[PDB]
Structures are given as structure tokens and as C-alpha cells.
């Protein structure tokens, strides 16, 4: 339900190291570190947006 095609097409960069090692689970940021590591993601990104049937 998201029409933009950035899911799983590159979350393997912070979110698999960063978002896998770092503070991704901790809600104190989330959204706040947007743009310099982990940030608000949680969700990892795997076909949600690229693709609503993925």
C-alpha cells in the first residue's frame, strides 16, 4: 500500500547493517535518524512498496 519502489531495492545498506546491528528496535529516534545510520525504519523493507503483491 505505497507507491514509490524503495523497499527491498536497497534496504541492504543500513538497514542490514544498520538497521540489523544498530538501533532500529529502540524507539527513541526512530524517524530522527533518518539519513544517518539506522533510523525510524523497523519495517526493513521487503517488496511493500515496489510491489503490493511482492
Known amino acids: 500500500a505505497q507507491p514509490k519502489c ?3 531495492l536497497h ?3 543500513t538497514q542490514d547493517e544498520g ?3 544498530g ?3 529502540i524507539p527513541y529516534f526512530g ?3 533518518e539519513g544517518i545510520y539506522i533510523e525510524g525504519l ?3 523493507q ?5 510491489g503490493l503483491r511482492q
Open 23 to 25: 538501533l532500529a528496535w
Open 31 to 33: 524517524p530522527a535518524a
Open 42 to 44: 523497523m519495517h526493513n
Open 6 to 8: 524503495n523497499p527491498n
Open 46 to 50: 521487503d517488496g511493500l512498496i515496489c
Open 11 to 13: 534496504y541492504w545498506t
Open 19 to 21: 538497521a540489523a546491528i
